[PDB]
Design a protein around this ligand. Structure first.
Ligand code: VPR
Ligand code: VPR
Lengths: 145, 147
């Protein structure tokens, strides 16, 4: 993971400054588990998850099944969060996820900006924004196609 | 070019309104985007600045930024911007929105979901990065911007 020119070099960049930000960075560390059953414990029952290029999942079961599917085709090898911030119940993370496509063995560093809504320390929404095509082309996996 | 309020919209009012001076300028800037006017819009930027639509290469410096905006407004109109969520920490403002984009060659429109980040220094933009999926827009409006 190379540090972007535009990324803060400040010691507190990417560091949690509130309880919700702390939970979100714990969740980022947990992504490299590639384990949907572990991850789903961060979510509220009334919840949703969406990789924005693709349809959303609503409710905890749909979220879990979506993560389990994703982890059947790819591994999150590494996550680095350059920037984190929050206001009014929403946490934002500017990061890179290093993804490896299991069918092809090829990896790509995916640039993501994501938003997390937490209610009493549980995730009520998680939406990640990124370009899907560039990932698909890098790793020869037509996730949507 | 109606924008639908998402099922996932925050029910906290402060989440949808500018709560700091920097957030207020960002929302003024979002209002201005419908001008389709790169010369007007560039006044929001510092001389030392950068802009990137994340599917595409970054522009560094105010002139490169202006030239990029001018090119974009040659091929598309931003017909509307709605910002559902705005917040900030550590000198960065984040906006979750939909921009309604219309391709000038084809007359076709698309509602593009975007999450963007802004860095402001003394009220001027020093960085702006918008994250979104480019392919869905290109296919919707028949404009292979990247291809
Ligand atoms: C389960 C993780 C999904 C990926 C992006 C999918 C293309 C990510 N957030 O790194
Ligand atoms: C000039 C504005 C660029 C567009 C997206 C380009 C594909 C936007 N921010 O709505």
């Amino acid at each position: 993971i190379e540090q972007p020119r535009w990324a803060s070099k400040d010691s507190a960049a990417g560091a949690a400054s509130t309880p919700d930000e702390k939970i979100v960075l714990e969740f980022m560390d947990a992504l490299t588990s590639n384990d949907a059953a572990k991850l789903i414990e961060y979510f509220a029952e009334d919840t949703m998850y969406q990789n924005m290029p693709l349809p959303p999942a609503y409710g905890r079961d749909a979220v879990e099944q979506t993560l389990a599917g994703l982890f059947t085709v790819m591994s999150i090898d590494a996550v680095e969060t350059f920037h984190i911030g929050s206001s009014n119940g929403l946490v934002y993370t500017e990061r890179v996820d290093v993804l490896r496509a299991l069918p092809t063995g090829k990896s790509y560093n995916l640039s993501i900006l994501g938003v997390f809504q937490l209610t009493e320390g549980k995730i009520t929404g998680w939406r990640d924004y990124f370009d899907l095509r560039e990932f698909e082309e890098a790793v020869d996996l037509p996730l949507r196609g």
